[PDB]
Amino acid sequence: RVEDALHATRAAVEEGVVAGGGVALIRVASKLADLRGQNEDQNVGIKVALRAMEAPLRQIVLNCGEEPSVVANTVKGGDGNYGYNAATEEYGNMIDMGILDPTKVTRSALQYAASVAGLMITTECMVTDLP
Amino acid sequence: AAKDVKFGNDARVKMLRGVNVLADAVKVTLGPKGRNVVLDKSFGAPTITKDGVSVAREIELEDKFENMGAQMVKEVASKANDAAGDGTTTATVLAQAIITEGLKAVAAGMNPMDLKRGIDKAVTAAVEELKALSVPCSDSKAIAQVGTISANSDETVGKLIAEAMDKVGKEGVITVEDGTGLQDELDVVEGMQFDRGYLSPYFINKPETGAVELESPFILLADKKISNIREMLPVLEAVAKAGKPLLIIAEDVEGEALATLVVNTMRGIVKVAAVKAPGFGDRRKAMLQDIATLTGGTVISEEIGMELEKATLEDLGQAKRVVINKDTTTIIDGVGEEAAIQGRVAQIRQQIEEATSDYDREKLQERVAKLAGGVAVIKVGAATEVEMKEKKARVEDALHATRAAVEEGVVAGGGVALIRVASKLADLRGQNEDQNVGIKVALRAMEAPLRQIVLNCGEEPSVVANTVKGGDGNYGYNAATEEYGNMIDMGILDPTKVTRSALQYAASVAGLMITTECMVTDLP
Amino acid sequence: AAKDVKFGNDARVKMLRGVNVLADAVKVTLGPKGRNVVLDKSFGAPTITKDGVSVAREIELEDKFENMGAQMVKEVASKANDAAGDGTTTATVLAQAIITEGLKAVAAGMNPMDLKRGIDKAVTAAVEELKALSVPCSDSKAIAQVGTISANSDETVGKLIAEAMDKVGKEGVITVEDGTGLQDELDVVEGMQFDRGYLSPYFINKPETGAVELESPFILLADKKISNIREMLPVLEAVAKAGKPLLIIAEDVEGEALATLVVNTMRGIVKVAAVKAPGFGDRRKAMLQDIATLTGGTVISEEIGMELEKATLEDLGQAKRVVINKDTTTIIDGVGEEAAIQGRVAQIRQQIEEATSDYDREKLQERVAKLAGGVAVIKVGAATEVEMKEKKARVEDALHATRAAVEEGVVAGGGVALIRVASKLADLRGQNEDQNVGIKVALRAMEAPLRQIVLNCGEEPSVVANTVKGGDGNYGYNAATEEYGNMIDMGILDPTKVTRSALQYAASVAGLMITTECMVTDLP
Amino acid sequence: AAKDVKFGNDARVKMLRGVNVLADAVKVTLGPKGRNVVLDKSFGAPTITKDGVSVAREIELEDKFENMGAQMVKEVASKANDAAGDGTTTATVLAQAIITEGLKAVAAGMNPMDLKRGIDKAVTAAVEELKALSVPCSDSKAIAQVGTISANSDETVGKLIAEAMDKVGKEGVITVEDGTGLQDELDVVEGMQFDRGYLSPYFINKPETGAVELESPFILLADKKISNIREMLPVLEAVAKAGKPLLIIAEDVEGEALATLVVNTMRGIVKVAAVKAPGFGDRRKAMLQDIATLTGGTVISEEIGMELEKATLEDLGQAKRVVINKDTTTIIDGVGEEAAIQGRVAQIRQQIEEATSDYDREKLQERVAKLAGGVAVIKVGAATEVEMKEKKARVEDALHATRAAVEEGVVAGGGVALIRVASKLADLRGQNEDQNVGIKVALRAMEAPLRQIVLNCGEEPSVVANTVKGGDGNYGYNAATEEYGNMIDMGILDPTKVTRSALQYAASVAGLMITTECMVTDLP
Ligand SMILES: Nc1ncnc2c1ncn2[C@@H]1O[C@H](COP(=O)(O)OP(=O)(O)OP(O)(O)=S)[C@@H](O)[C@H]1O
Ligand SMILES: Nc1ncnc2c1ncn2[C@@H]1O[C@H](COP(=O)(O)OP(=O)(O)OP(O)(O)=S)[C@@H](O)[C@H]1O
Ligand SMILES: Nc1ncnc2c1ncn2[C@@H]1O[C@H](COP(=O)(O)OP(=O)(O)OP(O)(O)=S)[C@@H](O)[C@H]1O
Ligand SMILES: Nc1ncnc2c1ncn2[C@@H]1O[C@H](COP(=O)(O)OP(=O)(O)OP(O)(O)=S)[C@@H](O)[C@H]1O
Ligand SMILES: [Mg+2]
Ligand SMILES: [Mg+2]
Ligand SMILES: [Mg+2]
Ligand SMILES: [Tl+]
Ligand SMILES: [Tl+]
Ligand SMILES: [Tl+]
Ligand SMILES: [Tl+]
Ligand SMILES: [Tl+]
Ligand SMILES: [Tl+]
Ligand SMILES: [Tl+]
Ligand SMILES: [Tl+]
Ligand SMILES: [Tl+]
Ligand SMILES: [Tl+]
């Protein structure tokens, strides 16, 4: 519990800490709603990514037994570092409640997940060994 | 016949599977954001409809046990239709939600008999809470508002109903028929309506209405049980002679005489319709002669020396159009002498004076009010023929909604009435833990109608239902405009009667189905 | 390796099915009215036993998912055995009852995480209530009563234990070995016991005990990690020369050196046994030299210039019998100079004087008390050889029960202790409805042990459990005599420790199993 | 290994089916009107035999569960053989009859634990009743009668036994070996017999006897556990040098050293045989030196400075033929100085004088009586070689029957002893109804041995058993002559010991099998 704590603190210095509970991404989602591409197909590509940013929060709520749709809708209505605490089933300021994620980890989690999805969406042919 | 028998958990899962087919086929047609259901016919083109009744009627499954389940909840939909005419889909979505959640508890290991009592207590309390939430329609100005929004924002429809109810009263009899020309007509003619229905469902020649209709029909009256058709033959012989329809009002019609008229009418030989006599016992014999002088016939009771064999056109009662529902018969505009009509009216208004008992007073008053009061007729005026059709089809429904708006009132629509009741009964408890869950099953079932409308609208039902519960009163969701607000102000409203019927009936069947342990059906 | 993955309800039913096999195979052997379970062996005759541990160990299912379930609750039975030595069957009957009723709630649609917390809170409260119901064994007269009834009404057994505990104390170390002749002997010899176990389970040469045993074993001591066997070779070369067993006490034994000794011992070449050093850090280096002068060896830490290659019999510690459990090692009667034993004892009794901290005082006191205090030895006296066997087998168990009778005490047997706790926690509630059921699951699980004993006795469990609940206190059912009465007065009692272990462990696994959603295993 | 588990009724029917195969294969060989059972061998001709043991040994079923059943009752047959040598078929016919009728009651819905106790009480009473029916053989004239009829009316056999028992006594040791010439010889030579058996069954080089035999064998004596073969090697090196067999008497022989001698002996390299030391504890160390001076070896206990590596032929004990049964070892005619034999005898006859305790007196008396008393040898005299065979094979059995005739006596044969006990225990009752049936099961099982003999004789068993029950005393049925009469007068008799063993053992297994609820075996 020192090894992990050092790893989190390391990332807390390099890039900082954002609001946890997957609210950081869902907060970014509402702030990029005006973002557009070059054609209609690119425009959907953005909306795919923005609706993907809601999923981490939605998944935590699903494990908590509560309806993810209701909770995500409430978090989006309020602004800032206002989120859902799944441990206590209480809403409030995430930073004040000690729920936080190092910015570095959330940046890595998003970038990498997009990198592979990008490669997989552009896949047309697959070659493997015969059963 | 060899039978198949299933027990317990094995037997129940076949019902649930069965009801889920009928429910899912009907629940898709809920609300104004509803979907179309296509029903196949052997002859030509398929029928595309949103009518939850038409869809329900068609469902019949292969697996005999599944079929039973489906056919059980179907019996409710049709009965909700019999009570109000509206809310058949709303009944079915409720029934499913009580059954699905109910059976879950039974399978968890809870007492079905305690679960039923939990539901019924929650319902009796919900009907009681619903009456408090109801906004009555008293004056003829608020009555016009209900007839307008029910006929798709048509002010001409609501104006006619208000004028019709101002003539015969709120208890009075109102009927709609085809128009003569270009303007809507309204007359009050000498007629009567009583509480009996068709003695067989094979007389329904207006399948859309689900009722019987006879133009200028000759009417028969006799106090006795018609079993042999021998006595009917000379009457039927003279009816196809000068071909006009025939109404049979008797103590009853049994076996041989009855089962002949059915294959008789469908083949095309003679238009017939059979109904039990009005009332029972003493009033039976008087309400017949009440019909008689309303129609201009004769009572042929087998007493003085009168038979059905020597009964001609001369001995029969004539009226210029009759309608017979499942449990409603009405004779519009009969013959008879008007002075001998008031001469029969004053023959019974004289009884009330000598009425030494207060019960006679009750049942002598019901006669005259519908006998000298009469029956109203709304003749629907349109220019083109296709416009004459739709204006009739949107007055009939509008009258049915207005009828219920007077009797019990109107609650907030959008399925919010039930979801408002749900939050107000959260403190309700039973006698044991098993009863307590039975209540919570019923309360979570009341959320389903709203949730289903939102599902059809494409929006997430969980989000919308959660928002409606947070706000209070007649605040709900408009699925047509995708806007929140006051339902009453937006014209979205349901007659209290239809929502009460939809809930009660759906609970009644679910209660019976939850307490099911054994099923017996024919072998495949 | 290709894997098979099952989710949710599908995944859980495979566990339940799996645990139900292991449980039903073990629950039949509960109580004194228990049934025999026959276990097949490839070589010769089958084993007929009532021992719930032996039956549990053998269960391993074909369906990989079912196997997992079974193997999960098996991990508890064995761990209950590790904590007390008793109540392995009682653990398993509990675990089943929590799982079966738990999963029922999950399938009904309740939060597993709330169900777990409900169970654990009910358990933490039950352990707390159990301590209050416990009747302590303080004086050596009531200690004799427990050792008597545990060894089948034998007064000679209980007398020996009481005399042994009067010599070394309640915290003192007591060991049983084979007798010399016709009378029971009791000496206190210079020995020590510490909290480490066998570094591999393949040294168990007494399968019934589930432990290791070495007669006149040579002992090795070195502070470092033994990974290569190169350094061990010259030591092992001189041990088969004058063939006597060998005890390896080191910081640890890793990989190559360890995995060789296992195929070494089972083949028959050299009797070995490997154990981690006593304690960690600072006391590690001192408790080694505490063993050293207890045994008469030397600490060969790689500091001054000492290696394991130049380490003969001369540099090794000798003792006249050692035992090694899973988590218990004990060196009985070592060599060393007695004056240099007290010379090492007074080298550490001198530390307590200079002990500027109160923690040193704690961990300098534990050394000497088990070092100059010693280890007791009960030499079992019998006439015939077959009588020498059973008297040993009924002292070992009797000592284990008496040990637990001192540490936590004894509650009322017959599974009434738990059923008494059940009625006293009926007012216990959680935070939400789902937690509330979690408690009621645990309380109805506490009834099962009693109910299972009654089932084996042939009587209806429902009737007997209902009668025990009506009466209060230590009033229960005697399955042997089919009589009701005071359990304590009838000699039917369970050490509090075993019942606490049986409940806690069974809840711990059920808690983990209820919160299971996904299972991953190898493909068939 | 994946396992298959069956429960309850399903599990039991597989046992019954299993035992019925073994029983029906053995019960056909009962009595003198018995049938032949043919046993196949891979090498050459099949074996035709009537020996119930040889048939039992061969049975092993395909269905793993059935096999278990069969293998369970097989364990009894072999154990009855170990107790008496006779009545293995009579045991098996009893066991079946208790199991078949027992399981019938269990399936009817009766408590197995009450059924077992009912049987065992009926048995304990039957053994008690059997002792009363027994006619003892005291004088050496009635002892001659038993040895005569057991060896097929041969008077020469019975004369030798009586003369042998007149030399060493009734407790004395009597052995038979091959003759030198034409007359039967009888000498009393210095020897001893003790209560230990072969440490492995793979030394049996006389398969018909089921025992080990070594001609002029060298004997080893050491008090310690032989685990490594390193210490044995120099001893074994000098034995194949001047090739003579070897007897290993030690505290024990463990693992590596033991499992080598087995693949050693069967290959053909060195004739070995391993046995535990005589007695345990103190007498262990003295009875070794009791063997020593009986044999002329030395005790090589690891005390003074003596090892097994420096132990030559010179340090070993010599005797001129040893036999080792499963639980019987006997050293016939050893070396040693006769004056130092009486010098060791008077070294222990001196102990009894100083014996301050009465227990020493008991266990110092057993030594000398079999040490200075000796062992008898009957050298079988015949003319031809084939006649030398059979005369040996009919003295060995005749000695075994006579042995049991002295210890407990002889009851009436023809299975009438048990059927006589059956009628005398008809008033015996248990504690509840279920126990009462348990007794009646055992009593109807006692009829089966007789009934089976009659079945082989071709006559109806029901008729004969009914006739035997009507008459009283030692009146029974002679199956050989098809005549009724006094069994004792007709020479038909069974040693009480064999009938007691046959009943007790058959009940012991049936008791365990009736209380079976779960079976665990390997997957097919
Ligand atoms: N009380 C809480 N309420 C809501 N979210 C929480 C709470 N506590 C932690 N979290 C969120 O939990 C998320 C992390 O989930 P984890 O289970 O740690 O999975 P992970 O970090 O992706 O991978 P692992 O399993 O740690 S290697 C973080 O983004 C936190 O924001
Ligand atoms: N704009 C609206 N927004 C939300 N709900 C509406 C709206 N308009 C009507 N409703 C609801 O629609 C529900 C009725 O659905 P319908 O489709 O009429 O089904 P039904 O009445 O159960 O049976 P049928 O099909 O009429 S026979 C009523 O309860 C209204 O509250
Ligand atoms: N005469 C009796 N009547 C009722 N219960 C009894 C009686 N004697 C013992 N018991 C109960 O028997 C229970 C123990 O059953 P056991 O067969 O010992 O199973 P276990 O202790 O869980 O595991 P094993 O098999 O000993 S390793 C104890 O809780 C006693 O309360
Ligand atoms: N002439 C006879 N008539 C009736 N019974 C007889 C007669 N001769 C012997 N017996 C009975 O035969 C029974 C013994 O049967 P055996 O064939 O010897 O089987 P067993 O003794 O059980 O086992 P084996 O085969 O000897 S190892 C004895 O109990 C005798 O009572
Ligand atoms: Mg509608
Ligand atoms: Mg126990
Ligand atoms: Mg025999
Ligand atoms: Tl929750
Ligand atoms: Tl609809
Ligand atoms: Tl007419
Ligand atoms: Tl929409
Ligand atoms: Tl047990
Ligand atoms: Tl040693
Ligand atoms: Tl019983
Ligand atoms: Tl035989
Ligand atoms: Tl020899
Ligand atoms: Tl015969």
CSV table of C-alpha atoms in Angstrom, one decimal, chain B residues 269-480:
chain,number,residue,atom,x,y,z
B,269,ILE,CA,-81.7,-15.5,-44.1
B,270,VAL,CA,-83.5,-13.0,-41.8
B,271,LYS,CA,-81.8,-10.4,-39.6
B,272,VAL,CA,-82.3,-11.5,-36.0
B,273,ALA,CA,-81.1,-10.4,-32.5
B,274,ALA,CA,-81.9,-12.0,-29.2
B,275,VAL,CA,-82.0,-10.4,-25.7
B,276,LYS,CA,-83.1,-11.3,-22.2
B,277,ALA,CA,-86.1,-9.4,-20.7
B,278,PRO,CA,-85.4,-6.2,-18.8
B,279,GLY,CA,-85.1,-6.8,-15.0
B,280,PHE,CA,-86.2,-9.8,-13.0
B,281,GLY,CA,-89.3,-11.0,-11.1
B,282,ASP,CA,-92.0,-8.4,-10.8
B,283,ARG,CA,-90.5,-5.4,-12.7
B,284,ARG,CA,-89.7,-8.0,-15.4
B,285,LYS,CA,-93.4,-8.2,-16.3
B,286,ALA,CA,-93.9,-4.5,-16.1
B,287,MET,CA,-90.8,-3.3,-17.9
B,288,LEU,CA,-91.9,-5.5,-20.8
B,289,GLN,CA,-95.1,-3.6,-21.1
B,290,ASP,CA,-92.9,-0.5,-20.5
B,291,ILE,CA,-91.1,-1.5,-23.7
B,292,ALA,CA,-94.4,-2.5,-25.3
B,293,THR,CA,-96.0,0.9,-25.1
B,294,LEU,CA,-92.6,2.4,-25.9
B,295,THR,CA,-92.5,0.3,-29.1
B,296,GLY,CA,-96.2,-0.4,-29.9
B,297,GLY,CA,-96.3,-4.2,-29.5
B,298,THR,CA,-98.0,-6.5,-27.0
B,299,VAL,CA,-96.8,-8.7,-24.1
B,300,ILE,CA,-97.5,-12.3,-25.0
B,301,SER,CA,-97.2,-14.0,-21.6
B,302,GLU,CA,-98.6,-17.5,-21.5
B,303,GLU,CA,-101.4,-16.6,-19.1
B,304,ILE,CA,-104.7,-15.3,-20.6
B,305,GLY,CA,-104.5,-17.6,-23.6
B,306,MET,CA,-101.9,-16.1,-25.9
B,307,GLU,CA,-99.3,-18.1,-28.0
B,308,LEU,CA,-96.3,-17.3,-30.2
B,309,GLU,CA,-97.7,-19.2,-33.1
B,310,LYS,CA,-100.7,-16.9,-33.6
B,311,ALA,CA,-98.6,-13.7,-33.4
B,312,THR,CA,-98.4,-11.6,-36.5
B,313,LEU,CA,-96.8,-8.2,-37.6
B,314,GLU,CA,-99.9,-6.7,-36.0
B,315,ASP,CA,-99.0,-8.0,-32.6
B,316,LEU,CA,-95.4,-6.8,-32.8
B,317,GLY,CA,-93.6,-3.6,-31.7
B,318,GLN,CA,-91.9,-1.3,-34.2
B,319,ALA,CA,-88.9,1.1,-33.7
B,320,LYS,CA,-86.7,3.0,-36.2
B,321,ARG,CA,-83.3,1.6,-35.1
B,322,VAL,CA,-82.0,-0.5,-32.2
B,323,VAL,CA,-78.5,-1.1,-30.9
B,324,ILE,CA,-77.4,-4.0,-28.6
B,325,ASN,CA,-74.0,-4.1,-26.8
B,326,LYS,CA,-72.5,-6.9,-24.7
B,327,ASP,CA,-74.4,-5.5,-21.7
B,328,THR,CA,-76.4,-2.6,-23.2
B,329,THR,CA,-79.6,-2.6,-25.2
B,330,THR,CA,-81.4,0.6,-26.4
B,331,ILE,CA,-84.6,1.0,-28.4
B,332,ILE,CA,-84.5,4.4,-30.3
B,333,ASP,CA,-87.8,6.0,-31.3
B,334,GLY,CA,-90.7,3.5,-31.1
B,335,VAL,CA,-94.3,3.8,-32.2
B,336,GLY,CA,-97.2,3.7,-29.7
B,337,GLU,CA,-99.7,6.4,-29.0
B,338,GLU,CA,-98.1,9.4,-27.3
B,339,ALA,CA,-101.2,9.9,-25.1
B,340,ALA,CA,-101.0,6.2,-24.2
B,341,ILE,CA,-97.3,6.6,-23.6
B,342,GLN,CA,-97.9,9.4,-21.0
B,343,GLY,CA,-101.0,7.2,-20.2
B,344,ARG,CA,-98.6,4.4,-19.1
B,345,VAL,CA,-96.1,7.0,-17.6
B,346,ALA,CA,-98.9,8.3,-15.4
B,347,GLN,CA,-100.0,4.7,-14.6
B,348,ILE,CA,-96.7,4.3,-12.8
B,349,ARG,CA,-96.3,7.9,-11.5
B,350,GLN,CA,-99.6,7.0,-9.7
B,351,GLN,CA,-97.9,4.0,-8.1
B,352,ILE,CA,-95.3,6.2,-6.3
B,353,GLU,CA,-98.3,7.8,-4.5
B,354,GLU,CA,-99.6,4.5,-3.2
B,355,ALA,CA,-96.0,3.2,-2.6
B,356,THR,CA,-96.2,2.2,1.0
B,357,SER,CA,-92.5,1.1,0.8
B,358,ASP,CA,-89.5,3.2,-0.1
B,359,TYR,CA,-88.0,0.5,-2.4
B,360,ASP,CA,-90.9,0.6,-4.8
B,361,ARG,CA,-90.3,4.4,-4.9
B,362,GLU,CA,-86.7,3.6,-6.0
B,363,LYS,CA,-87.7,1.2,-8.8
B,364,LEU,CA,-90.8,3.1,-10.0
B,365,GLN,CA,-88.6,6.2,-10.5
B,366,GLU,CA,-86.1,4.5,-12.8
B,367,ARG,CA,-88.8,3.4,-15.2
B,368,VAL,CA,-90.3,6.9,-16.1
B,369,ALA,CA,-87.1,8.9,-16.1
B,370,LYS,CA,-85.8,6.8,-19.0
B,371,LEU,CA,-89.3,6.3,-20.5
B,372,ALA,CA,-90.8,9.8,-20.5
B,373,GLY,CA,-87.2,11.3,-20.5
B,374,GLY,CA,-86.4,9.6,-23.7
B,375,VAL,CA,-83.3,9.1,-25.9
B,376,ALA,CA,-81.2,11.8,-27.7
B,377,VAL,CA,-80.0,11.5,-31.3
B,378,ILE,CA,-77.1,13.3,-32.8
B,379,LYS,CA,-77.3,13.2,-36.6
B,380,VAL,CA,-73.7,13.8,-37.9
B,381,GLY,CA,-73.5,16.5,-40.7
B,382,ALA,CA,-70.7,16.5,-43.2
B,383,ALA,CA,-70.2,17.3,-46.9
B,384,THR,CA,-68.4,14.4,-48.4
B,385,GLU,CA,-69.0,10.7,-47.6
B,386,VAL,CA,-65.5,9.9,-46.2
B,387,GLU,CA,-65.8,12.9,-43.9
B,388,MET,CA,-69.2,11.6,-42.6
B,389,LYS,CA,-67.3,8.4,-41.6
B,390,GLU,CA,-64.5,9.9,-39.4
B,391,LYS,CA,-66.8,12.5,-37.7
B,392,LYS,CA,-68.9,9.6,-36.5
B,393,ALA,CA,-65.8,7.6,-35.4
B,394,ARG,CA,-64.6,10.6,-33.4
B,395,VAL,CA,-67.9,11.5,-31.7
B,396,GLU,CA,-68.5,7.9,-30.5
B,397,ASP,CA,-65.2,7.8,-28.6
B,398,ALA,CA,-65.5,11.4,-27.5
B,399,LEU,CA,-68.9,10.5,-26.0
B,400,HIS,CA,-67.4,7.5,-24.2
B,401,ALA,CA,-64.7,9.6,-22.6
B,402,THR,CA,-67.1,12.4,-21.7
B,403,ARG,CA,-69.4,9.8,-20.1
B,404,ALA,CA,-66.6,8.7,-17.8
B,405,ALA,CA,-65.6,12.3,-17.2
B,406,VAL,CA,-69.0,12.9,-15.6
B,407,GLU,CA,-69.3,9.7,-13.5
B,408,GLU,CA,-66.0,9.7,-11.7
B,409,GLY,CA,-64.1,12.7,-13.2
B,410,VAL,CA,-60.7,13.1,-14.9
B,411,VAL,CA,-57.2,12.6,-13.5
B,412,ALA,CA,-53.8,13.8,-14.8
B,413,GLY,CA,-52.8,11.8,-17.9
B,414,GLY,CA,-49.4,10.5,-19.1
B,415,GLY,CA,-49.7,7.8,-16.6
B,416,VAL,CA,-48.7,10.3,-13.9
B,417,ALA,CA,-51.9,9.7,-11.9
B,418,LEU,CA,-50.7,6.3,-11.0
B,419,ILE,CA,-47.1,7.3,-10.4
B,420,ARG,CA,-48.4,10.1,-8.2
B,421,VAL,CA,-50.4,7.6,-6.2
B,422,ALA,CA,-47.3,5.4,-5.9
B,423,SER,CA,-45.3,8.0,-4.0
B,424,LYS,CA,-48.3,8.7,-1.7
B,425,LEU,CA,-48.6,5.0,-0.6
B,426,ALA,CA,-44.9,4.4,0.2
B,427,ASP,CA,-45.8,4.2,3.9
B,428,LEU,CA,-48.4,1.5,3.3
B,429,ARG,CA,-47.7,-1.8,5.1
B,430,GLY,CA,-49.4,-5.2,5.4
B,431,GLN,CA,-49.5,-7.8,8.3
B,432,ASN,CA,-46.3,-9.8,7.5
B,433,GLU,CA,-43.2,-9.4,5.4
B,434,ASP,CA,-44.7,-11.3,2.5
B,435,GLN,CA,-47.7,-8.9,2.4
B,436,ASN,CA,-45.3,-6.0,2.5
B,437,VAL,CA,-43.6,-7.1,-0.7
B,438,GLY,CA,-47.0,-7.6,-2.3
B,439,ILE,CA,-47.7,-3.9,-1.9
B,440,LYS,CA,-44.2,-2.8,-3.2
B,441,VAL,CA,-44.9,-5.1,-6.2
B,442,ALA,CA,-48.1,-3.2,-6.9
B,443,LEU,CA,-46.5,0.3,-6.4
B,444,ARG,CA,-43.6,-0.5,-8.8
B,445,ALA,CA,-46.3,-1.7,-11.3
B,446,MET,CA,-47.9,1.7,-11.3
B,447,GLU,CA,-44.7,3.2,-12.7
B,448,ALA,CA,-44.8,0.9,-15.8
B,449,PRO,CA,-47.5,2.7,-17.8
B,450,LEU,CA,-45.5,6.0,-17.8
B,451,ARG,CA,-42.3,4.1,-18.3
B,452,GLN,CA,-43.7,2.3,-21.4
B,453,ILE,CA,-44.9,5.6,-23.0
B,454,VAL,CA,-41.4,7.0,-22.6
B,455,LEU,CA,-39.9,3.9,-24.1
B,456,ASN,CA,-41.9,4.4,-27.2
B,457,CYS,CA,-40.9,8.0,-27.3
B,458,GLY,CA,-37.2,6.9,-27.6
B,459,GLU,CA,-36.2,8.6,-24.3
B,460,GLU,CA,-34.8,6.6,-21.3
B,461,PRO,CA,-37.8,5.7,-19.1
B,462,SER,CA,-35.7,5.6,-15.9
B,463,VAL,CA,-34.6,9.3,-16.4
B,464,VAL,CA,-38.1,10.6,-17.1
B,465,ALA,CA,-39.9,8.7,-14.3
B,466,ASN,CA,-37.3,9.9,-11.9
B,467,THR,CA,-37.9,13.5,-12.9
B,468,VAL,CA,-41.7,13.2,-12.6
B,469,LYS,CA,-41.4,11.7,-9.1
B,470,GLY,CA,-39.2,14.6,-7.9
B,471,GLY,CA,-41.8,17.2,-8.9
B,472,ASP,CA,-45.2,17.2,-7.3
B,473,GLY,CA,-48.9,17.4,-8.4
B,474,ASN,CA,-50.1,17.2,-12.0
B,475,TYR,CA,-46.6,17.7,-13.3
B,476,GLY,CA,-45.7,15.1,-16.0
B,477,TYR,CA,-44.1,14.3,-19.3
B,478,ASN,CA,-45.6,15.2,-22.7
B,479,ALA,CA,-44.4,12.4,-25.1
B,480,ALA,CA,-45.8,14.2,-28.2
